[PDB]
Amino acid sequence: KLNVSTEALQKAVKLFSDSSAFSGFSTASGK
Amino acid sequence: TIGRISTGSKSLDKLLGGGIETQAITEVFGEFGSGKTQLAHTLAVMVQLPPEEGGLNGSAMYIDTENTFRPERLREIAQNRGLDPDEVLDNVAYARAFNSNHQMQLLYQASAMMVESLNTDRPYKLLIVDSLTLAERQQKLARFLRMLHRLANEFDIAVFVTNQVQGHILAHSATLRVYLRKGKGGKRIARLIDGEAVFSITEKGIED
Numbered sequence: 001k002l003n004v005s006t007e008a009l010q011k012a013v014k015l016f017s018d019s020s021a022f023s024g025f026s027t028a029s030g031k
Numbered sequence: 032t033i034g035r036i037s038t039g040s041k042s043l044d045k046l047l048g049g050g051i052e053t054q055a056i057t058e059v060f061g062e063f064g065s066g067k068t069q070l071a072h073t074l075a076v077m078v079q080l081p082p083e084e085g086g087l088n089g090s091a092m093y094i095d096t097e098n099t100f101r102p103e104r105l106r107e108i109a110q111n112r113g114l115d116p117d118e119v120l121d122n123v124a125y126a127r128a129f130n131s132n133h134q135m136q137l138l139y140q141a142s143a144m145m146v147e148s149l150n151t152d153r154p155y156k157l158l159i160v161d162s163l164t165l166a167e168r169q170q171k172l173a174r175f176l177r178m179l180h181r182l183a184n185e186f187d188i189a190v191f192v193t194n195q196v197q198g199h200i201l202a203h204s205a206t207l208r209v210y211l212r213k214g215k216g217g218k219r220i221a222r223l224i225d226g227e228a229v230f231s232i233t234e235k236g237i238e239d
C-alpha cells in the first residue's frame with residue numbers, strides 16, 4: 001500500500017482548481 | 032528538457048523520435064489484441080532504467096480500467112531484460128478504476144504522489160491510463176484530458192493512454208497519435224496518425 005501526505009493532496013487540488021492519507025494506489029507487489 | 036522513454040523496440044523508438052516523450056500525452060489506438068496493454072506494461076518497466084538504457088530512472092503509475100494489469104507479466108519482462116523483478120514491481124504504483132468518477136479521483140491522488148516524489152532518487156516519470164475508452168460524460172472526459180495535460184507539463188512526466196477502436200479515428204486534442212494493427216506472423220505494425228514501425232510482443236515485452 002502506498003501513502004500520500006495531506007499537504008501534497010492539498011497542493012494537487014489547488015493545481016487542478018481552475019500527516020498521511022489514503023492514496024488509492026499500491027505497488028504492483030501489493031504494498 | 033524533454034525526456035524520452037524507450038518502448039523496447041528499435042523500430043518503434045525511431046517512429047516516435049527516440050521513445051515516448053515527457054510533457055506530452057501519447058495516445059495509442061487499435062483494435063482488440065493490437066498490443067496497447069502489452070506496450071503499457073513494457074513502458075512501466077522501461078521508465079525505471081537509467082537514461083543510458085532508455086529510461087528516466089523513474090517510477091510508473093498505472094490506472095487500469097480494463098482489469099488487464101498483470102504484475103506477473105511485469106516480472107517476465109523484467110527478468111528477461113536482466114532486472115530484479117521484485118524491484119521493478121515496487122516501482123509500479125497501480126490502481127484499478129471502476130468508473131469515470133473513480134478515475135478522476137485517482138488522478139488527483141496520482142498528482143499528489145507526483146508532488147511528493149519530486150526531487151527524490153526515483154520520481155514518478157510515467158502515467159498510464161489503460162484504457163481511456165450523455166452530455167455529462169463527454170464533459171468529464173474533456174476535464175480528465177485537461178488534467179492529464181497539466182500533469183505532463185507541471186511534473187515533466189510522460190502520459191500514455193490507450194483507445195480501443197471498433198481507419199477514421201477521432202483522436203483527442205494536442206496528443207501524439209499512434210495506430211497499432213496486427214501484421215504478418217505475430218508482427219504488429221505502428222503508424223503515426225498525423226513512416227511505419229514493425230515490432231513483436233515477446234517475453235521481453237515489446238521488441239523488434
Ligand SMILES: Nc1ncnc2c1ncn2[C@@H]1O[C@H](COP(=O)(O)OP(=O)(O)O)[C@@H](O)[C@H]1O
Nearest residue numbers: 061062063064065066067068069070232233234
Ligand atoms: N507473455 C506474452 N508473450 C508474448 N505475447 C503475449 C504475451 N501475453 C500476451 N501476448 C500477446 O500480446 C498481444 C497484445 O495483447 P494486448 O496488449 O492485450 O492488446 P490490446 O490491449 O490492444 O487488446 C496479444 O496478441 C497477446 O496474445
Ligand SMILES: [Mg+2]
Nearest residue numbers: 067068097099
Ligand atoms: Mg488491452
